[PDB]
Design an enzyme around this catalytic site. Structure first.
Site, PDB file in Angstrom:
ATOM      1  N   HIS A  64      82.926 -50.407 -11.317  1.00  0.00           N
ATOM      2  CA  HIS A  64      82.931 -51.882 -11.136  1.00  0.00           C
ATOM      3  C   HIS A  64      82.744 -52.314  -9.682  1.00  0.00           C
ATOM      4  O   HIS A  64      82.245 -53.399  -9.505  1.00  0.00           O
ATOM      5  CB  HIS A  64      84.218 -52.438 -11.694  1.00  0.00           C
ATOM      6  CG  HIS A  64      84.468 -52.097 -13.113  1.00  0.00           C
ATOM      7  ND1 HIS A  64      85.361 -51.114 -13.491  1.00  0.00           N
ATOM      8  CD2 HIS A  64      83.947 -52.619 -14.232  1.00  0.00           C
ATOM      9  CE1 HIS A  64      85.412 -51.087 -14.807  1.00  0.00           C
ATOM     10  NE2 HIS A  64      84.488 -51.946 -15.294  1.00  0.00           N
ATOM     11  N   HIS A  89      87.910 -52.725  -1.328  1.00  0.00           N
ATOM     12  CA  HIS A  89      86.696 -52.720  -2.162  1.00  0.00           C
ATOM     13  C   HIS A  89      85.881 -53.976  -1.878  1.00  0.00           C
ATOM     14  O   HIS A  89      86.368 -54.879  -1.181  1.00  0.00           O
ATOM     15  CB  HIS A  89      87.019 -52.543  -3.652  1.00  0.00           C
ATOM     16  CG  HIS A  89      87.745 -53.715  -4.205  1.00  0.00           C
ATOM     17  ND1 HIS A  89      89.131 -53.735  -4.286  1.00  0.00           N
ATOM     18  CD2 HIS A  89      87.294 -54.892  -4.687  1.00  0.00           C
ATOM     19  CE1 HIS A  89      89.502 -54.806  -4.839  1.00  0.00           C
ATOM     20  NE2 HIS A  89      88.418 -55.626  -4.971  1.00  0.00           N
ATOM     21  N   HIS A  91      82.673 -56.984  -3.302  1.00  0.00           N
ATOM     22  CA  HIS A  91      81.981 -57.718  -4.385  1.00  0.00           C
ATOM     23  C   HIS A  91      80.707 -58.282  -3.766  1.00  0.00           C
ATOM     24  O   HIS A  91      80.712 -58.716  -2.595  1.00  0.00           O
ATOM     25  CB  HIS A  91      82.831 -58.885  -4.899  1.00  0.00           C
ATOM     26  CG  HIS A  91      84.181 -58.452  -5.364  1.00  0.00           C
ATOM     27  ND1 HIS A  91      84.406 -58.033  -6.671  1.00  0.00           N
ATOM     28  CD2 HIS A  91      85.400 -58.399  -4.746  1.00  0.00           C
ATOM     29  CE1 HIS A  91      85.704 -57.777  -6.825  1.00  0.00           C
ATOM     30  NE2 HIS A  91      86.321 -57.945  -5.659  1.00  0.00           N
ATOM     31  N   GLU A 102      83.315 -63.832  -4.006  1.00  0.00           N
ATOM     32  CA  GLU A 102      84.170 -64.374  -5.097  1.00  0.00           C
ATOM     33  C   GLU A 102      84.655 -65.798  -4.759  1.00  0.00           C
ATOM     34  O   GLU A 102      84.447 -66.753  -5.529  1.00  0.00           O
ATOM     35  CB  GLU A 102      85.297 -63.365  -5.320  1.00  0.00           C
ATOM     36  CG  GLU A 102      84.836 -61.971  -5.709  1.00  0.00           C
ATOM     37  CD  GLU A 102      85.697 -61.413  -6.813  1.00  0.00           C
ATOM     38  OE1 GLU A 102      86.825 -61.009  -6.483  1.00  0.00           O
ATOM     39  OE2 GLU A 102      85.278 -61.358  -7.967  1.00  0.00           O
ATOM     40  N   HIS A 115      87.843 -57.074  -0.141  1.00  0.00           N
ATOM     41  CA  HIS A 115      89.271 -57.221  -0.480  1.00  0.00           C
ATOM     42  C   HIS A 115      90.064 -56.042   0.038  1.00  0.00           C
ATOM     43  O   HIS A 115      89.747 -54.953  -0.295  1.00  0.00           O
ATOM     44  CB  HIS A 115      89.454 -57.389  -1.991  1.00  0.00           C
ATOM     45  CG  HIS A 115      88.894 -58.676  -2.475  1.00  0.00           C
ATOM     46  ND1 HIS A 115      88.499 -58.908  -3.774  1.00  0.00           N
ATOM     47  CD2 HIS A 115      88.651 -59.799  -1.779  1.00  0.00           C
ATOM     48  CE1 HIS A 115      88.130 -60.182  -3.840  1.00  0.00           C
ATOM     49  NE2 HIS A 115      88.171 -60.729  -2.644  1.00  0.00           N
ATOM     50  N   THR A 196      91.123 -60.455  -9.556  1.00  0.00           N
ATOM     51  CA  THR A 196      89.858 -61.049 -10.043  1.00  0.00           C
ATOM     52  C   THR A 196      89.063 -60.078 -10.957  1.00  0.00           C
ATOM     53  O   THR A 196      88.045 -60.507 -11.414  1.00  0.00           O
ATOM     54  CB  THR A 196      88.959 -61.403  -8.891  1.00  0.00           C
ATOM     55  OG1 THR A 196      88.555 -60.219  -8.191  1.00  0.00           O
ATOM     56  CG2 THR A 196      89.587 -62.384  -7.938  1.00  0.00           C
TER      57      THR A 196
HETATM   58  N1  LIG Z   1      89.607 -58.123  -6.647  1.00  0.00           N
HETATM   59  S1  LIG Z   1      91.164 -57.585  -6.695  1.00  0.00           S
HETATM   60  O1  LIG Z   1      91.711 -57.622  -5.343  1.00  0.00           O
HETATM   61  O2  LIG Z   1      91.825 -58.437  -7.626  1.00  0.00           O
HETATM   62  C1  LIG Z   1      91.217 -55.996  -7.235  1.00  0.00           C
HETATM   63  C2  LIG Z   1      92.452 -55.123  -7.226  1.00  0.00           C
HETATM   64  F1  LIG Z   1      93.544 -55.725  -6.750  1.00  0.00           F
HETATM   65  C3  LIG Z   1      92.526 -53.702  -7.745  1.00  0.00           C
HETATM   66  N2  LIG Z   1      93.648 -52.916  -7.823  1.00  0.00           N
HETATM   67  C4  LIG Z   1      95.016 -53.365  -7.655  1.00  0.00           C
HETATM   68  C5  LIG Z   1      95.829 -52.131  -7.233  1.00  0.00           C
HETATM   69  C6  LIG Z   1      97.296 -52.202  -7.625  1.00  0.00           C
HETATM   70  C7  LIG Z   1      97.696 -51.076  -8.584  1.00  0.00           C
HETATM   71  C8  LIG Z   1      97.227 -51.100 -10.038  1.00  0.00           C
HETATM   72  C9  LIG Z   1      96.029 -51.993 -10.336  1.00  0.00           C
HETATM   73  C10 LIG Z   1      96.277 -53.461 -10.035  1.00  0.00           C
HETATM   74  C11 LIG Z   1      95.462 -54.122  -8.926  1.00  0.00           C
HETATM   75  C12 LIG Z   1      91.318 -53.023  -8.281  1.00  0.00           C
HETATM   76  S2  LIG Z   1      91.307 -51.497  -8.885  1.00  0.00           S
HETATM   77  O3  LIG Z   1      90.336 -50.738  -8.166  1.00  0.00           O
HETATM   78  O4  LIG Z   1      92.637 -50.936  -8.794  1.00  0.00           O
HETATM   79  C13 LIG Z   1      91.027 -51.494 -10.544  1.00  0.00           C
HETATM   80  C14 LIG Z   1      92.253 -52.051 -11.293  1.00  0.00           C
HETATM   81  C15 LIG Z   1      91.983 -52.466 -12.747  1.00  0.00           C
HETATM   82  O5  LIG Z   1      90.722 -53.150 -12.885  1.00  0.00           O
HETATM   83  C16 LIG Z   1      90.119 -53.867  -8.272  1.00  0.00           C
HETATM   84  N3  LIG Z   1      88.888 -53.443  -8.644  1.00  0.00           N
HETATM   85  C17 LIG Z   1      88.349 -53.663  -9.978  1.00  0.00           C
HETATM   86  C18 LIG Z   1      87.345 -52.556 -10.287  1.00  0.00           C
HETATM   87  C19 LIG Z   1      86.456 -52.304  -9.057  1.00  0.00           C
HETATM   88  C20 LIG Z   1      87.298 -51.837  -7.857  1.00  0.00           C
HETATM   89  C21 LIG Z   1      88.194 -52.961  -7.446  1.00  0.00           C
HETATM   90  C22 LIG Z   1      90.029 -55.272  -7.790  1.00  0.00           C
HETATM   91  F2  LIG Z   1      88.794 -55.775  -7.906  1.00  0.00           F
HETATM   92 ZN   LIG Z   2      88.325 -57.670  -5.298  1.00  0.00          ZN
END
Ligand SMILES: NS(=O)(=O)c1c(F)c(NC2CCCCCCC2)c(S(=O)(=O)CCCO)c(N2CCCCC2)c1F
Ligand SMILES: [Zn+2]
Ligand SMILES: NS(=O)(=O)c1c(F)c(NC2CCCCCCC2)c(S(=O)(=O)CCCO)c(N2CCCCC2)c1F
Ligand SMILES: [Zn+2]
Lengths: 260, 260
Positions: A64, A89, A91, A102, A115, A196
């Site tokens: 993603h 990461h 977007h 975003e 982010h 998000t």
């Molecule tokens: N845009 S955002 O800041 O909201 C935000 C996050 F916050 C978290 N990860 C967090 C890490 C905390 C521990 C468990 C997962 C919850 C959120 C992740 S994640 O890696 O952990 C995937 C979690 C489930 O989809 C993502 N992604 C979504 C997929 C692409 C990589 C970034 C994100 F986009």
């Molecule tokens: Zn993000």
């Protein structure tokens, strides 16, 4: 399971990830009608952000986005609780519509968004535990626009050709993560919102810096064109483009600014 | 069953109406990257828009918006098929954020939006039959900006205090619906999209006029404050506000323009 395009796209997240149709969703359009200056908002401090070039950090294509694992030695100072880093990461959009931030400002997309995800290490032992819990997460958001070549962002982008497909991994030598942040970090937007992405937990304290950073058109095009959402054995490859969510309704609520 | 806010809001519509998570969704942001001039987009002809002043047309508060029934004698000429009118209705924001258009232009909302809904009367015997079929619907969209008083829109707005609650009805004497259209109707955006409400059918040929009309602040404030989503007999009244859908993803779709 979830995507940003077609039948498993964002309007369908709520089928299997109910909080995607719930409260406090992000991202949002930052616009005068929902902003309020708050003089209690102090500058954030960034501690432990100078990572050693002699240490390696895991870069992963998770299907993603591209994500960089970050150590919990990295902290934000200036929030209610200490928040410790877990990962960053990005977007972005696509080469034919290179507007994939975003958050928007007065309805305007930026080219991309960074982010830097942190968890509440005062209340919780790790990011997973914090993720779906109260005051669990704090995210720093950096708006990205076209301009000068950015050597700091290239410390990430130079490895993209090694994580083209879902599950692929590469190692990135430590550098000072503050180099990914803009000027005058003291000017930012602050609001309570969500992940998000699925599961869209409403557990994020958002800090969106007012000032964007700049990357070159070549850097933005590499980011937009390097990656795929699919495994290397997937007969139906999908380009990783337009991996941003649409802005959410934001009604009878306020975004606080550190600037008047 | 569906709303614009809270648990049954737009991120959950796909749980109830499969097309709301499908392809070709509306509304969209009209911005330069996705615009393509098309000299084949010649002026529409508005036939029977001058409604008989000896007829009356039903204005209804259906709990989501205010809708005026229009007769099938009204039609658009200039498309491949004739399209006959069925109804018009509006979408608006709220007094604290009076930017409730559905389509946006370069990321900006207008104050409100008028839709005049038509069906393919060449291919289909009525609007309900046409709505899930190929080329079944054509909607004219008029962007509404805060500006001068508009006596033609007041032909509708003067009746709002008789359709305040869900299910309530009033009669509007026939008038010239063409008076609701902007200057230079030859200038428009054209694209293939959907109903912007459930059931979200991807069967709409959209024409969004380039130029907005103006209504006064006082007319806008009356539209934003007169109506409720609840029945008159409900002692917990809920204001009818922000009855617009967020813009949708639009990749490998173009918008065609009659202007460059
Ligand atoms: N845009 S955002 O800041 O909201 C935000 C996050 F916050 C978290 N990860 C967090 C890490 C905390 C521990 C468990 C997962 C919850 C959120 C992740 S994640 O890696 O952990 C995937 C979690 C489930 O989809 C993502 N992604 C979504 C997929 C692409 C990589 C970034 C994100 F986009
Ligand atoms: Zn993000
Ligand atoms: N924005 S829009 O132009 O897409 C659009 C339409 F087109 C149609 N009506 C279409 C034609 C008449 C009925 C046949 C079924 C298709 C809907 C309608 S509708 O009245 O028929 C209701 C359909 C069921 O919710 C609406 N509403 C939504 C609720 C408030 C009034 C306007 C609409 F917003
Ligand atoms: Zn409509």
């Amino acid at each position: 399971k979830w995507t940003y395009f077609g039948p498993d796209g964002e309007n369908s997240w709520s089928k299997k990830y109910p909080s995607c149709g719930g409260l406090l969703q992000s991202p949002i359009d930052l616009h005068s009608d929902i902003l309020q200056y708050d003089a209690s908002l102090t500058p954030l401090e960034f501690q432990g952000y100078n990572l050693s070039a002699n240490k390696q950090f895991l870069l992963t294509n998770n299907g993603h986005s591209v994500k960089l694992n970050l150590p919990s030695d990295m902290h934000i100072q200036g929030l209610q609780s200490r928040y410790s880093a877990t990962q960053l990461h990005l977007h972005w959009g696509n080469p034919n519509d290179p507007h994939g931030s975003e958050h928007t400002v007065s309805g305007q997309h930026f080219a991309a968004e960074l982010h830097i995800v942190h968890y509440n290490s005062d209340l919780y032992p790790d990011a997973s535990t914090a993720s779906n819990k109260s005051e669990g997460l704090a995210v720093l958001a950096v708006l990205i626009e076209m301009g000068s070549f950015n050597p700091s962002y290239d410390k990430i982008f130079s490895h993209l050709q090694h994580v083209k497909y879902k599950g692929q991994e590469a190692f990135v030598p430590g550098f000072n993560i503050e180099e990914l942040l803009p000027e005058r970090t003291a000017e930012y937007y602050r609001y309570r919102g969500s992940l998000t992405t699925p599961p869209c937990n409403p557990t994020v304290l958002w800090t969106v810096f007012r000032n964007p950073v700049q990357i070159s058109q070549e850097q933005l095009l590499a980011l937009e064109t390097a990656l795929y959402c699919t495994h290397m054995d997937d007969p139906s490859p999908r380009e990783m483009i337009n991996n941003f969510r649409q802005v959410q309704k934001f009604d009878e609520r306020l975004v606080y600014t550190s600037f008047s």
